[PDB]
Amino acid sequence: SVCAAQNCQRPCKDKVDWVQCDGGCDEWFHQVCVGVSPEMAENEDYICINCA
Ligand SMILES: [Zn+2]
Ligand SMILES: [Zn+2]
């Protein structure tokens, strides 16, 4: 299982929350692989490179 990101490091951890881009792709990205901070995930709406 590979997530959505031009460069996905494919890290699998049980303590790593994921982010969805609710701008139109509905795909799931890793906060480290797509460069998101845990703070952004809970407070802001994650738009991705393709949504942007
Ligand atoms: Zn990823
Ligand atoms: Zn998107």
Q: What is the domain partition of the chain in residue ranges?
A: 1-52
* C-alpha 21 – ligand 2 centre gap (Å): 5
- Tell me which fold the domain 1-52 belongs to: Herpes Virus-1 (3.30.40)
Method: NMR
Residue closest to 20 by CA, chosen among 50, 45, 49? 45
* C-alpha 52 – ligand 2 centre gap (Å): 7
Give yes or no for a contact between 32 and 12, defined as CB atoms under 8 angstroms apart.
no
Secondary structure (3-state) at 5: coil
Pair of tokens at residue 37? 């901070």
* C-alpha 11 – ligand 1 centre gap (Å): 7
Task: Spell out a b/e string for 5-24, using b for 16 or more CB atoms within 10 Å of the CB, else e.
Answer: beeeeeeeeeeeeebebeee
Looking up tokens 């797509």 gives 34
Burial (Cβ within 10 Å: 0-12, 13-18, ≥19) of residue 45: exposed
Give yes or no for a contact between 25 and 51, defined as CB atoms under 8 angstroms apart.
yes
